[PDB]
């Protein structure tokens, strides 16, 4: 059901391995589909469905715009450093924007952060920017005084962003709307029982531990759901139990790919 | 598709 389009922009004053001076990543339903950085200087596909569906003009325009954004982000690091009276050093500037389509309604956001703390965010309902502190109030004033900044962002988030998200979902439908069943294995140590689900899609899942059919919530440990390299996901749940109550315990897995919850034993 | 302003 729900879909999202998001762009993540990261600029750093001190690059390091794995961390270019500037990177932009676009994601649809949480999966990266395009990436640009200051070293390749090209917007590049990271999934097949995007290449097979847009023209070379898409790549050229995205590459030109990203080359322009690189410069802006370089300037914004400088401005932020001076607003906070900071010496040269290691700093980060990040911005994220995007839209969600759910049921009939639309959500959109645009927000930036400096050294990992909020700086400024759009309030799309009031067409104002919310400033985290005095430094960010100067930016609030600049963007609100310009007279068109919040309105252009409102337009992009509610219109342009949603229009592209619909096109993306349509291009990727076979990937994005597929269902892949979890492959589940139960293990145990010294007794710690572990129910691990491998390779499911989409990411929502519910793994519960039952003692003779009884949902043991308060005693269930759970990881964060995490991706595999092929765009499928992984999740686990453990239970700390007394050695040799073993027969009693079953793992239940609820997932869209499974018409009925799966039940698994050690 | 990826508005980006100076702060």
């Amino acid at each position: 059901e729900p879909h999202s389009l998001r762009y993540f922009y990261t600029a750093v004053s001190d690059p390091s391995p794995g961390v270019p001076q500037f990177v932009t990543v676009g994601s649809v339903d949480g999966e990266v589909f395009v990436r640009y950085d200051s070293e390749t200087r090209k917007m590049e596909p990271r999934v097949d469905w995007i290449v097979a569906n847009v023209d070379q003009q898409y790549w050229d325009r995205e590459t030109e715009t990203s080359r322009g954004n690189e410069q802006i982000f370089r300037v914004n690091l400088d401005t932020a450093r001076e607003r906070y009276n900071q010496s040269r050093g290691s700093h980060t500037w990040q911005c994220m924007h995007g839209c969600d389509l759910e049921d009939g309604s639309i959500r959109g956001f645009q927000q930036c952060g400096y050294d990992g703390k909020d700086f400024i965010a759009l309030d799309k309902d009031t067409l104002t920017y919310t400033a985290a502190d005095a430094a960010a109030q100067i930016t609030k004033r600049k963007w609100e005084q310009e007279g068109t900044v919040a309105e252009q962002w409102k337009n992009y988030l509610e219109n342009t962003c949603i229009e592209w998200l619909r096109k993306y979902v349509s291009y990727g439908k076979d990937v994005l709307e597929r269902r892949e069943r979890p492959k589940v294995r139960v293990s145990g140590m010294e007794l710690t029982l572990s129910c691990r689900a491998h390779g499911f899609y989409p990411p929502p899942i519910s793994i519960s531990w039952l003692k003779d059919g009884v949902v043991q919530e308060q005693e269930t440990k759970r990881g964060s759901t995490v991706p595999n390299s092929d765009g499928t996901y992984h999740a686990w749940a453990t239970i700390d139990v007394l050695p040799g109550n073993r027969d009693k315990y079953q793992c239940r897995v609820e997932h869209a790919s499974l018409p009925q919850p799966g039940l698994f034993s050690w | 598709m990826v508005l980006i302003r100076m702060i």
């Binding site: 390091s16 990436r35 050294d115 990992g116 691990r196 491998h198 995490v226 992984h234 | -």
Partner: protein, 100 residues
């Protein structure tokens, strides 16, 4: 807050069968700043053909990255993900539990 420490999970694409080709994953999230070294080690030695996906980040600005490599687990070999980040004082190792 200056910094946020990585939280790390290490896991395989498929349930582990000794002698069967698989993929080892190390997913690292919740960290800031983005500088980080994430290494997949077989018996403490860097594995071949490791790949590092593009980072994402959350509402709270913290970064996430998937690092992975093909591998064929055996009963005896030891697989770890070792992460060095400035919000740790010393690099931290996370052992994959084979669960064969």
């Amino acid at each position: 807050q200056a910094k946020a420490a990585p939280k790390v999970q290490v896991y395989s694409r498929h349930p582990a069968t000794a002698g069967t080709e698989n993929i080892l994953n190390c997913y690292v999230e919740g960290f800031h700043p983005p500088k980080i070294d994430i290494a997949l080690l077989k018996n403490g030695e860097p594995m071949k053909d490791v790949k590092y996906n593009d980072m994402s980040f959350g509402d709270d600005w913290t970064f996430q990255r998937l690092v992975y490599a093909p591998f064929t687990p055996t009963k005896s070999d030891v697989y770890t993900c070792r992460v060095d980040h400035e919000a740790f004082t010393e690099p931290q190792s996370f052992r994959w539990e084979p669960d064969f």
